């Protein structure tokens, strides 16, 4: 071709007068078909980007601008649509402010100042809103995470005074978005849930989801409401979308239902349909089933077959809870553990501190984990991550690695150095450090003195059995001071009022020391 070359050259040299609608049209035709090279000529895209950036964007809907930015970002050039200004005096109306908020939310750029300005301007003209606009602005505000409860309360009052002029999905959206605002008075919530209860006859399968989500976010305080909906659910348990039954289980877990009669029948229906779930709903179906203590062999086999499908490519934050659940089940599921360990081996470099700490913790007493390579490689990363770990993750990782028999001497020295600037709030927060330092039994005396000074105030709390562990750890670490031994001896004497041969040798030597 010849004229095509000239057109391309005229476009690249940036003499063409392009308006935003033309660049939108060209972006669409390149996005959908691209028969001729558009996304493979970097200079053409650069010239088009310059034309778009310099051109006025006020003549396009937000969605097309978002499409333009999205097709620009694919080829390797950053792009962000221009922001909008608040309308002036005469251009103010209930329709333009909603447009401002909608453009704010669509393009994924938010701002607090414009939100404050539009919520200040909306109040005087609040009477001009159509009954179907309030249910739109309410779910728009709750998508911007605007913690302003009085305006949303006014909107809720106006919506509920206009009850008959909205569809079922509007009530669904209003309820789910309302439940996401913290500062609401509870009477308004009661009245909204009652309004929802009145309209069971018109609901659709998606439209249950929002009400169930609102109830889960609210908790047991609205328990009777969840009693009614689940009753209305008894006529459809034969066929539901698996997400709906998963939400039913989650609400059951978060509500503490004391009536297993319906929980059982819902779970039996979920058992066969769970195969269609994705990763997230599968994991939280697993958690919901485990918390209410229903996992038996028949469902365990099915869900193991369901989770092995994802086992190869788990998301790291969805691995630890699965190991936790399989820990507290007596059935045989060693293969799922094996594949999960193999997957967690690969993600070692990208794992954060807390995830690694919890993963190591859950493998404290697993015998097959005594020889798997993660005994060492994980520890190596634990060496580097140690500067970021909090007290909880540090204690968990130390407990797990000590229970696995990790023979690095300097590791626990650095652990003690890190913990000495944190302080400890309880015996559990300190026990793994002593346990780790007990693998060898020797260390510089100053840190032993500091550990003794930390242990001394904690003696008043632990019972007779735990004082034995404390004495066993102290004596082996070459402790010498006395104001620690007498502190433990006083607590021991608080229980046993006489020296007797029944107590073990450590108690005998402590009572005479």
């Amino acid at each position: 071709p010849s004229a095509l070359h000239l057109i391309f050259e005229r476009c690249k040299l940036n003499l063409v007068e392009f308006t935003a609608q033309d660049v939108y049209q060209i972006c669409t035709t390149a996005y959908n078909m691209d028969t001729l090279g558009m996304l493979q000529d970097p200079d053409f895209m650069r010239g088009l980007h310059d034309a778009f950036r310099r051109s006025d964007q006020t003549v396009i809907s937000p969605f097309q601008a978002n499409l333009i930015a999205d097709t620009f970002r694919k080829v390797g050039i950053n792009s962000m649509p221009k922001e909008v200004s608040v309308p002036e005096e005469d251009a103010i109306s209930p329709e333009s402010l909603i447009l401002v908020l909608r453009n704010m939310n669509i393009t994924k750029q938010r701002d607090e100042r414009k939100i404050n300005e539009v919520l200040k301007l909306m109040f005087p003209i609040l009477d001009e809103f159509s009954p179907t606009q309030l249910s739109l602005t309410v779910t728009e505000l709750a998508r911007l995470k605007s913690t302003n409860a009085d305006f949303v309360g006014k909107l809720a009052k106006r919506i509920m005074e206009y009850n008959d002029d909205l569809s079922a999905l509007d009530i669904s959206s209003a309820a789910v978005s309302l439940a996401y605002c913290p500062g609401i008075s509870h009477n308004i919530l009661y009245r909204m849930m009652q309004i929802v209860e009145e309209r069971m006859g018109e609901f659709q399968p998606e439209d249950y989801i929002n009400v169930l989500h609102a109830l889960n976010t609210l908790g047991p305080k609205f328990v009777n409401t969840f009693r009614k909906i689940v009753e209305c659910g008894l006529q459809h348990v034969e066929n539901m979308d698996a997400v709906t039954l998963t939400n039913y289980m989650v609400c059951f877990s978060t509500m503490d239902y004391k009536q297993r009669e319906h929980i059982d029948i819902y779970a039996d229906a979920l058992v066969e349909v769970a195969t269609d779930l994705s990763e997230k709903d599968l994991v939280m179906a697993f958690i919901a089933l485990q918390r209410l203590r229903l996992l038996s062999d028949t469902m365990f086999g099915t869900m193991a077959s369901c989770v092995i499908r994802y086992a190869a490519k788990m998301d790291p934050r969805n691995i630890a809870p699965i190991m936790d659940i399989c820990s507290t089940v007596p059935h045989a599921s060693d293969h799922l553990m094996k594949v999960l360990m193999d997957r967690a081996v690969e993600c070692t470099r990208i794992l954060t501190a807390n995830q690694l700490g919890d993963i190591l913790d859950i493998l404290g007493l697993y015998p097959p984990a005594r020889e798997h390579p993660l005994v060492q490689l994980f520890g190596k990363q634990a060496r580097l991550r140690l500067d970021l770990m909090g007290p909880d993750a540090l204690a968990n990782a130390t407990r797990g690695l000590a229970n696995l028999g990790y023979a690095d001497p300097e590791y626990y020295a650095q652990a003690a150095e890190t913990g000495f600037r944190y302080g400890f709030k309880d015996w559990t927060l300190l026990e793994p450090m002593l346990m780790g330092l007990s693998i060898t039994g020797q260390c510089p005396p100053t840190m032993v003195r500091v550990l003794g000074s930390h242990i001394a105030p904690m003696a008043r709390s632990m019972s007779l059995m735990e004082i034995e562990r404390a004495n066993r750890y102290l004596r082996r670490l070459g402790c010498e001071d006395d104001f620690v031994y007498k502190a433990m001896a006083s607590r021991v004497l608080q229980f046993v009022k006489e020296v007797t041969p029944e107590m073990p040798e450590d108690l005998q030597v402590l009572l005479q020391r």
Binding site: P182, T217, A288, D426
Partner: protein, 296 residues
Amino acid sequence: LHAFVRSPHYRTIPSAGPNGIVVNRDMLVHQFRDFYKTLQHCSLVDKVHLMSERPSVEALRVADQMVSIGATFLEMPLTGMEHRATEFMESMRYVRGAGGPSTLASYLQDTENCRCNSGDVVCLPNGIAVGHGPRTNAVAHTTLKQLFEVKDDQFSFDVFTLEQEGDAPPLGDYFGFAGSNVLLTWKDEHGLLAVDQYQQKQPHTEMNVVYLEPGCHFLSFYGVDHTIDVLVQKGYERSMDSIAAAGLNPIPVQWSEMDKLGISMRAAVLPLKFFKANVGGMLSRNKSRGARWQTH
């Protein structure tokens, strides 16, 4: 679970107690410091958010503002305590800092001719125990019945009305629960009367009863969050072995100075069960515990 304590104002601790008993100014704050440090080392609480110093000594009593029933929190009527309103605001702010409830419930304040005072409320299995008499009147009992008396199978919530005499202190100070199915009380009139009345109210249940010496302050956190630790004042000896025989692990917190000012151990701490806000049908990780891998 969270707990809130308030540091006393050193410059204005009273010279002598209400009965004329001399109070050691420094030893009081020493006992406070030791008590708070013991409160941290318990392994059941999650945090202790320390408040700031305030002038009035009565402000050291913090549990009189709010009563927690079941799965909700409630605000006590302000009659007879008008000078402590402002501090309440400040305490609310601390609560908002933690992330629990936004604001309290306004049921009791709108019920006219209602006089109530906390301490009379004791949380017991699936129900509450409220003590009638000098503080709580009959109308308050009726109102509590209207709000929290449900009578459905598998969903019922009991309310128990225990009647005491005028001289009796608030019920929660000499009659309490611990762990589970374990009941403790004082070894005096208010003790046997209370346990006898409770047994007549619910004869179909039997609970271990272990008495304390009269005048001994104890605090046990009963509820769904089961605990096996009890705080007992360092002024008595037989109660320690009695509680140890009950199957509990006592802790001897020193409380000598605070007693002379008529403030119990209960009136210093305020425990709350915060409902973590789950988002979008998504559960939250809980404080797991147990014995992992019981099958090798």
